[PDB]
Amino acid sequence: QGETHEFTAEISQLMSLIINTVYSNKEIFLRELISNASDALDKIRYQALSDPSQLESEPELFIRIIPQKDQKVLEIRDSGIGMTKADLVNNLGTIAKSGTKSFMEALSAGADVSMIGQFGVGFYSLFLVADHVQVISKHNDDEQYVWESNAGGKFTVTLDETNERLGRGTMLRLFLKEDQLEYLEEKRIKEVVKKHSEFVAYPIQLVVTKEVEK
Amino acid sequence: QGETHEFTAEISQLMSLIINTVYSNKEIFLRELISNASDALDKIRYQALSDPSQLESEPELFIRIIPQKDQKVLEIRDSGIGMTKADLVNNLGTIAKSGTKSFMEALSAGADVSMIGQFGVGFYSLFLVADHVQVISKHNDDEQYVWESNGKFTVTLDETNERLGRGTMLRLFLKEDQLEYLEEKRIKEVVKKHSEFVAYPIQLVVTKEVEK
Ligand SMILES: C[C@@H]1C[C@H]2O[C@@H]2/C=C\C=C\C(=O)Cc2c(Cl)c(O)cc(O)c2C(=O)O1
Ligand SMILES: C[C@@H]1C[C@H]2O[C@@H]2/C=C\C=C\C(=O)Cc2c(Cl)c(O)cc(O)c2C(=O)O1
Ligand SMILES: [Mg+2]
């Protein structure tokens, strides 16, 4: 029952730029996704001021990073406001954010890719480190959905009948490129996170899997 | 489409015994579940010698322990052979396995619970530390199912949990006085003490907040 959609041209152009012309500072993808998560948590907190029942779906407010070495996947989960189906379709492909063209012009003018969040399209920096991505999201009073794309021209949005229940919020699953597997290692993730985590108000949890020795 | 079934008498009788018992070595539940996991992995490993395609669904052979503190749940996952819908219905409630009665009679006579695995029903020692349990399982060429009981149980097509690929995951809803088994140090102690001779990696998933 999976809708298929095409990326709007400006977003396809933006991903083209990012994938093909940005050679350094690829680690900023994690700052950008942590920022999106923090914003999403801000939003549910705001709603909770007028209606504290909105937090009941998932009471703890967190940002969680989960390296999955077996699958060569890096997951980033938050318990923020989450997204409906229409939210996923519009925020992540069909509507070009106002800043998309502006950001492409800024890159051409000499901007560092680190600036991408100032233009509201920080999501797309993940394609610096991944060719395939799933976005799982759960909004109050709606079902859980999965958005998926392979850094191409189309994406799908489907009712989620295969992933763990989020309760509320969003989880990105980054299928990392073969030369970008450094981001599955605890020490590298901590290094990158500590650079820009001094003013994040929420706990950033790192899930590490280690074999029991002895 | 969730089939609901009643526990067979001898199994319901057994769980009552275990759940109510006063034991001091309740930590043996983890040895029993790790042993079940190791057995399931042996079986898919052997089958894969004649048909290596059987591992493609989940190429890694592992035992994975995942404390979920927010939910007060301890998960134990393996990539073994898994169970069909019929396997779940029969193995875990409707058919009393040979040795169910024998172990209950031994327990009533005073035997230590540590003996349960020799009767092949070590699964039910999880009720030493949990009141509710879900068993998620995926066998090759069948769908993923969830068995659940908190004196009836249900088996349902799994459309809510992470895909296992292949194998089995127990989700133990721990009693309020048994939450020590969510702590990294306690689990490592129990694993090193009683599961030292397992042929597969036993992985512990630990969540730690980053110092911002
Ligand atoms: C619409 C909601 C709430 C918005 O406040 C967040 C700010 C920017 C979000 C941009 C998005 O594209 C969706 C999104 C992404 Cl990409 C992410 O990594 C994490 C998230 O939690 C959300 C989200 O759930 O977004
Ligand atoms: C039927 C298969 C293969 C069997 O060889 C294992 C030996 C005993 C298993 C007993 C069971 O009740 C099912 C089971 C349990 Cl309880 C468990 O904790 C972990 C598992 O991986 C399996 C399983 O998938 O078992
Ligand atoms: Mg072994």
Numbering used by the authors:
A (entry chain A): 5 to 218
B (entry chain B): 5 to 154, 157 to 218
Task: Give passages from the manuscript.
Hsp90 is essential in all eukaryotes where it regulates the form and function of diverse client proteins, many of which are key signal transducers. Hsp90 also serves as the previously enigmatic thermal sensor that controls temperature-dependent morphogenetic switching in C. albicans, a key factor contributing to the organism’s virulence. To identify potentially exploitable differences in the Hsp90 expressed by a fungal pathogen vs humans, we determined the crystal structure of the C. albicans Hsp90 N-terminal domain, which includes the nucleotide-binding pocket targeted by all Hsp90 inhibitors in clinical development.
We obtained structures for the domain under three conditions: apo (unliganded), in complex with ADP, and in complex with the prototypical inhibitor radicicol. Global structural similarity between fungal and human Hsp90 was also observed when comparing the chaperone-ADP and -radicicol complexes. Additionally, the N-terminal domain of C. albicans Hsp90 shares the same architecture at the nucleotide-binding site, which interacts with both ADP and radicicol through hydrogen-bond interactions at the same amino acids (Asp92 and Thr174). In initial work, the crystal structures of apo, ADP-bound, and radicicol-bound fungal NBD showed minimal structural variation. The natural product radicicol was the only Hsp90 inhibitor found to significantly inhibit growth of our engineered fungal strain.
